[PDB]
Amino acid sequence: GSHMHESKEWYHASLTRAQAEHMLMRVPRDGAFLVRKRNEPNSYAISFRAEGKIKHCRVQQEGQTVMLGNSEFDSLVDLISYYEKHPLYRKMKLRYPINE
């Protein structure tokens, strides 16, 4: 149950889906991304830009790991670190964290 993500510049504790989409409008670049807590327990979303559009990927927290689809990681920080090096959607990787 890592909490390290709570202090990361890309992580937002209170940000709805549409609020996240709006934030990704400011600097429209592929690879822009943020992570937000969803209203369901143990659920997060990556909101990001790829192929000129805004997309969302749901992430589940179960036990001692997090899951994006069937890809499993020890923590949200490890997940984000992985998708900065490996594509999350088609050819796009996480590149530009959205903070303030």
From Swiss-Prot:
Residues 10-98 form the SH2 domain. It is found in: Cell projection, Lamellipodium; Cell projection, Ruffle. Ubiquitinated by CBLB in activated T-cells. Tyrosine phosphorylated in response to signaling via activated FLT3, KIT and PDGFRA. Tyrosine phosphorylated by activated FGFR1, FGFR2, FGFR3 and FGFR4. Tyrosine phosphorylated by activated FLT1 and KDR. Tyrosine phosphorylated by activated PDGFRB. The receptor-mediated activation of PLCG1 involves its phosphorylation by tyrosine kinases, in response to ligation of a variety of growth factor receptors and immune system receptors. For instance, SYK phosphorylates and activates PLCG1 in response to ligation of the B-cell receptor. May be dephosphorylated by PTPRJ. It comes from the Eukaryota. The SH3 domain mediates interaction with CLNK. The SH3 domain also mediates interaction with RALGPS1. Interacts with AGAP2 via its SH3 domain. Interacts (via SH2 domain) with RET. Interacts with FLT1 (tyrosine-phosphorylated). Interacts (via SH2 domain) with FGFR1, FGFR2, FGFR3 and FGFR4 (phosphorylated). Interacts with LAT (phosphorylated) upon TCR activation. Interacts (via SH3 domain) with the Pro-rich domain of TNK1. Associates with BLNK, VAV1, GRB2 and NCK1 in a B-cell antigen receptor-dependent fashion. Interacts with CBLB in activated T-cells; which inhibits phosphorylation. Interacts with SHB. Interacts (via SH3 domain) with the Arg/Gly-rich-flanked Pro-rich domains of KHDRBS1/SAM68. Mediates the production of the second messenger molecules diacylglycerol (DAG) and inositol 1,4,5-trisphosphate (IP3). Plays an important role in the regulation of intracellular signaling cascades. Becomes activated in response to ligand-mediated activation of receptor-type tyrosine kinases, such as PDGFRA, PDGFRB, EGFR, FGFR1, FGFR2, FGFR3 and FGFR4. Plays a role in actin reorganization and cell migration. This is 1-phosphatidylinositol 4,5-bisphosphate phosphodiesterase gamma-1. The chain holds residues 663 to 758 of 1291 of the full protein.
